[PDB]
Design an enzyme around this catalytic site. Structure first.
Site, PDB file in Angstrom:
ATOM      1  N   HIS A 165      -3.603  13.768  13.546  1.00 50.89           N
ATOM      2  CA  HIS A 165      -3.798  12.377  13.179  1.00 50.89           C
ATOM      3  C   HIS A 165      -4.891  12.257  12.150  1.00 50.89           C
ATOM      4  O   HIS A 165      -6.048  12.020  12.489  1.00 50.89           O
ATOM      5  CB  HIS A 165      -4.106  11.533  14.416  1.00 50.89           C
ATOM      6  N   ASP A 180      -8.328  11.271  13.984  1.00 51.83           N
ATOM      7  CA  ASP A 180      -8.211   9.983  13.301  1.00 51.83           C
ATOM      8  C   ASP A 180      -9.160  10.013  12.091  1.00 51.83           C
ATOM      9  O   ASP A 180      -9.691   9.003  11.620  1.00 51.83           O
ATOM     10  CB  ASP A 180      -8.472   8.740  14.155  1.00 51.83           C
ATOM     11  N   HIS A 188      -5.025   7.106  20.798  1.00 49.65           N
ATOM     12  CA  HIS A 188      -6.161   6.204  21.008  1.00 49.65           C
ATOM     13  C   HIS A 188      -6.172   5.758  22.462  1.00 49.65           C
ATOM     14  O   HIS A 188      -6.664   4.693  22.819  1.00 49.65           O
ATOM     15  CB  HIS A 188      -6.065   4.919  20.158  1.00 49.65           C
ATOM     16  N   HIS A 198      -5.865  10.608   8.166  1.00 50.45           N
ATOM     17  CA  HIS A 198      -5.501   9.722   7.051  1.00 50.45           C
ATOM     18  C   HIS A 198      -5.777  10.490   5.754  1.00 50.45           C
ATOM     19  O   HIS A 198      -6.734  10.259   5.004  1.00 50.45           O
ATOM     20  CB  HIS A 198      -6.274   8.388   7.146  1.00 50.45           C
TER      21      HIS A 198
HETATM   22 ZN   LIG Z   1      -4.582   4.195  14.884  1.00 45.01          ZN
HETATM   23 ZN   LIG Z   2      -5.143   6.403  12.376  1.00 43.84          ZN
END
Ligand SMILES: [Zn+2]
Ligand SMILES: [Zn+2]
Ligand SMILES: [Cl-]
Ligand SMILES: [Cl-]
Ligand SMILES: [Cl-]
Ligand SMILES: [Cl-]
Ligand SMILES: [Cl-]
Ligand SMILES: [Cl-]
Ligand SMILES: [Mg+2]
Ligand SMILES: [Mg+2]
Ligand code: NA
Ligand code: NA
Ligand SMILES: [Zn+2]
Ligand SMILES: [Zn+2]
Ligand SMILES: [Zn+2]
Ligand SMILES: [Zn+2]
Ligand SMILES: [Zn+2]
Ligand SMILES: [Zn+2]
Lengths: 376, 376, 380, 380
Positions: free
Chosen positions: B68, B285, B230, B70
């Site tokens: 995960h 994340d 999450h 970005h």
């Molecule tokens: Zn998210």
């Molecule tokens: Zn994310």
């Protein structure tokens, strides 16, 4: 002598200032369309090439923010002869409106968001402050870029989306459609730095706010983005709106709807119900279709003070700070240093004498002195 | 002398090997980016032009797989200044990440799947292993080819689809939309040879996993393709996630979420609840929006061993074998002959010293020695 | 003690002012991001809560306007590893850039106008002034709204369109396509209050400016809207560019192309060809890829100014034109490129040898002692 | 007993090596599908668990690269009964083909790029190396993603576009359409790391190569990206093809067209015209329809090599070029067409009279004793 005229220095002197908070006799110094100082006894000579305005015995307050105007014209429900004309700059200013949110209604066939955007921009070039809502009563929404989310995100003047519910002129939207539309407005606002609101034209269906509650049940859009308007159109709806507000929502009362719940009355009721003024806004629905005017806005303030026991400060909230807050209108709705110099000068009886938009004199002796390009 | 340098022979010698299974002191022989032998006492001269690395006293384990990230940047929820920058190769490698799954989030207006795919490919050319998920929080998904199914089936690097539920930034998807999207990912994966998963960004709605359960009720996608992430963001959600896992699902804990359930804690709880580590993954994340880093991944392993009584092997699962298994990442997450030579060399205290990606030395003395094209 | 800080009163005193017009020693007073007075000996006490800055011994000039920057990154011509990263605020500001026009290049597959628009808006928010061009090398243009005309008219930050011609990376556009794209930008500009220009990335084809001439023969877009860029990339092209300028067009010289026609040299030759500086602009092509591969920077902008003055016989005033007033004029950048009351307070403070000391953008100090004191949200 | 089998160590010993360059007797060591060493007398014990193969008396060369195959089937010009079936793995491998480029022809109604892509991927999975061209005879191209540029840039296996010209089955494309398609393939190639070529199926129109020349006049795609195929179909066309090659283009000869210009003959004439072998390629057009109607096969590939050597005075080394190194070079097929350390282990083992004995693809034995020992999943 050095020329400092580019600063547009203006000192508004000695008026009883309502920010809307009562500030007593206080002066206001403006430069470049902005409020740069708010204090008692600012020296008339603090800055050069300063236009000093003696407001002794007058009232000074923030200009009105009317979030529901059919800027390019509306109407059309009884055929094409009922399409109203676009709004005139001076009609707004003479009414004390310095900031507007334009929108569309029933007709989204002969009315277009691109047209609304152009008029919105014309008004800004003309001197006031204008935004718009994408969509119209029609759901799914008719947009500029093909998506509500994209419109709110990328069209600078677009701040949210409009729709109609519980009304014989609605598109019979289902929950999914409404929720998705609201969610898109919400998300687009985050991205674009817009409030990302969803405005609901309410009709007279017995269902009233139910669609909004259903929507809440079907999504995670904060209740603070959902604005039901025309709430005073019917009692039962009005009563639901008070609950809605009690739950955390903001409700918009229409100054142009006299019965069954008058505007002032509506605002009065809200307070009786214990709702903070911050969650109560007043809009005109001006320029709709006869041809709706803007006089009811100021009339509403007058009546509230005159016949309802509201203080001047409280009476102003729903047209100023409450609106600015709901729409996150940075720099509007309050007289503070750093905010835009959008002000009203009134008689103690609350009759408008002067209007300043972005620091420029727009109305004098209650008559517009700045008119739109094609005004006569 | 014959030149055999094209083989890139590398012998990693004498480390305490955690495959993640504990293998004691064991050597690892690499050729052409692949693990070709895993045994005690492999002869330093078994192959020619062999780079012999003395790992005595050090730890050797599989490189991290962070599903995960970005990759191209994320953020944007507070306007455009909050759009984060694309990830840097060295940030990943220094963090022990050798395999990544890139995705999009809230913003799918200024962020595009085609862009994500290009960055994914850049990373592969640069030396690591990267895949992506099509879609973003937005549902219906915004895709490269016009269909989720087609994207998963035909875009080589695409392995599944991303979405958001129970979150104030969701698109207010309905069951049909979610189910159809997941079904498409599933089918596309079969065709394309991809896991065909559906990843769910979870928000703080009281509804929690309900949409997933509804979805299950409305389709035949195996629960093993549905990944809520999450999950440690809120207790009640976390608690639901444990049940979900108990029912056969896999749950993803975010290393960058400290409260109310810390990452290690989350993993610890799962085991307490009797969930096999194979159904627990940890992702960062990273690169989202301040600017999320990757340090929390290794920190999580350290804490688990240090403060929670996990063995080194168990502590590694959620970043290695559990991920590879969930994503069907052939050749990743385990040190075995035939697998890719993605390895971490650490101190006994679990501090990273060296990193190998596809058999190439990427980090030395804990510092990147291979940097992305435009890194400084 | 009345608080007048909201005004952001700032007084720059005693520098030698180039507006760019040489004005000798003269002061500049700023309020709310605007220049409110330009005169010698402005009283230090003229306005309350005034930040007085002593610029004696220094030079004061307008901030540069770089009309050719790959804000979100560019490159990509040698695979995905060659895609450059987005531009950092501080690189622009430390280079004297206060106004920028973002655009796309060869890659319009991994790069999108929506991305570029977001980046433009971020920069504005951070303190500078940014606009962009729609389209990219590809013709027909890939736009935000579906039409070039529509993008220029309705997307506030879009001021024109980009295209590539006479280049091995072009989309092989024919005259009709080019003309139509140009006329749509023109018309969208009128409706939107934008310059509505068409920017032509030039390549090395022997055809050089031919497509532009053909276009003029096939439409009525004014020559003042057609900007050929990278004109110094090859001699024959450069020489054709001088002719085009002589005919009323404006030409854009790339500061990052040092051969075969150096930027200062190209500017000097334009002057020697009878072209007024108002028709000569200089841009960086910053943030694109530079072949080990690197990111093109913005230093060549100021260096060109330095070189013109040192080696080409230019006055400081003239040397500044192609980065300030000529650009603003070409793009109708209202309030930019000139230090006049009413204009935005975008100024550079330099040493007498033209090295940047301070940079003000919209009246905000962005660079101090040559270092960005204002940085991008995620600046490293 | 340590297990080193994951390495797939294989040692080909003692053959006479044509890389295609003649290297005399020389060994080749393979690990993990890669050539890891090329030298004489590599020790048999150099690596553990090594499969040593005695190729004494034999020939070792690179596997062939057939850039023109109708992988999913073609035909259809005489109704639906003429639609040929998909290609079998074993037919390719037994013919020496280790790398292939799939494409579509006349029919793009019953045939789709998505189908072709799936087939390409299956072949890769089965052990060989396959790519494809987007589009088909039809212009504008029918693509996967909606744009030729996009397909080339983003679909991993797509390396260019196909089209038909000067042919009674063409779509009557005009220069603009052709140029635009060619430039999109070019640009998508740059972004994607593909050759970005345009392949032109040639017909018998008297116009021959004219459309290509017109295209060059109307764009800036390098001549090295434009490949005319079936050049030996007619004399006047063939002769024009020699000229095109002389000008820097590459020409593709079809092994399955035996008149009026035979493939070996065409190759020899190209050489006699001063064209370097690097600019001459040979492809089969396999799996299309062959008029009783049949499927065109791949045997003409090896036969052309045989014929050149036997009847046209070619060295084995040169005869191999048009099927190995020239193709890889034209398509920028990294790691293919040459036996060098680092390249893929795609090799053919032949007798001295050039008859195939073994075939290795990515280091895997696919053919043994001339027979596929590796077959398609559903092979009959
Ligand atoms: Zn998210
Ligand atoms: Zn994310
Ligand atoms: Cl109704
Ligand atoms: Cl008007
Ligand atoms: Cl939430
Ligand atoms: Cl990088
Ligand atoms: Cl930045
Ligand atoms: Cl097969
Ligand atoms: Mg002069
Ligand atoms: Mg020779
Ligand atoms: Na303008
Ligand atoms: Na390549
Ligand atoms: Zn209404
Ligand atoms: Zn209305
Ligand atoms: Zn360019
Ligand atoms: Zn450029
Ligand atoms: Zn053909
Ligand atoms: Zn064919």
């Amino acid at each position: 002598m050095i020329d400092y005229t580019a600063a547009g220095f203006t000192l508004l002197q000695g008026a009883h200032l309502y920010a809307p908070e009562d500030r007593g006799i206080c002066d206001v110094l403006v430069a470049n369309g902005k409020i740069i100082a708010v204090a008692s006894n600012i020296p008339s000579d603090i800055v050069p090439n300063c236009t000093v305005v003696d407001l002794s015995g007058q009232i000074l307050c923030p200009g009105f923010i009317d979030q529901h105007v059919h800027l390019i014209g509306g109407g059309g429900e009884a055929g094409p002869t009922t399409r109203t004309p676009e709004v005139a700059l001076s009609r707004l200013t003479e009414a004390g409106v310095t900031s507007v949110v334009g929108l569309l209604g029933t007709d989204s066939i002969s009315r277009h968001p691109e047209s609304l955007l152009a008029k919105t921009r014309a008004l800004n070039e003309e001197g006031i402050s204008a935004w718009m809502l994408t969509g119209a009563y029609h759901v799914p929404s008719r947009t500029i870029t093909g998506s509500v989310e994209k419109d709110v995100a990328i069209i600078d003047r677009v701040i949210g989306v409009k729709c109609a519910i519980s009304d014989h002129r609605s598109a019979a939207p289902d929950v999914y459609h409404l929720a998705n539309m609201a969610a898109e407005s919400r998300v687009g606002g985050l991205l674009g730095g817009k409030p990302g609101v969803t405005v609901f034209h309410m009709g007279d269906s017995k269902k009233a706010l139910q669609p909004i509650y259903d929507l809440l049940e079907n999504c995670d859009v904060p209740i603070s983005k959902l604005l039901p308007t025309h709430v005073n159109r019917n009692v039962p709806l009005f009563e639901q709106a008070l609950e809605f507000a009690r739950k955390g929502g903001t409700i918009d009362i229409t100054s142009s709807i006299d019965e069954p719940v008058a505007p002032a009355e509506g605002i009065a009721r809200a307070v009786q119900a214990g709702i903070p003024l911050a969650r109560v806004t007043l809009s005109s629905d001006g320029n709709g279709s006869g041809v709706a005017g803007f006089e009811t806005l100021l009339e509403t303030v007058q009546v509230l003070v005159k016949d309802y026991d509201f203080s001047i400060s409280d009476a102003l909230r729903p047209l100023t700070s409450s609106v600015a807050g709901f729409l996150n209108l940075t720099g509007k709705g309050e007289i503070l240093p750093g905010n835009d110099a959008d002000l009203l000068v009134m008689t103690p009886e609350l009759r408008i004498e002067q209007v300043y938009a972005r620091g420029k004199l727009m109305v004098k002796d209650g008559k517009a002195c700045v008119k739109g390009t094609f005004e006569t």
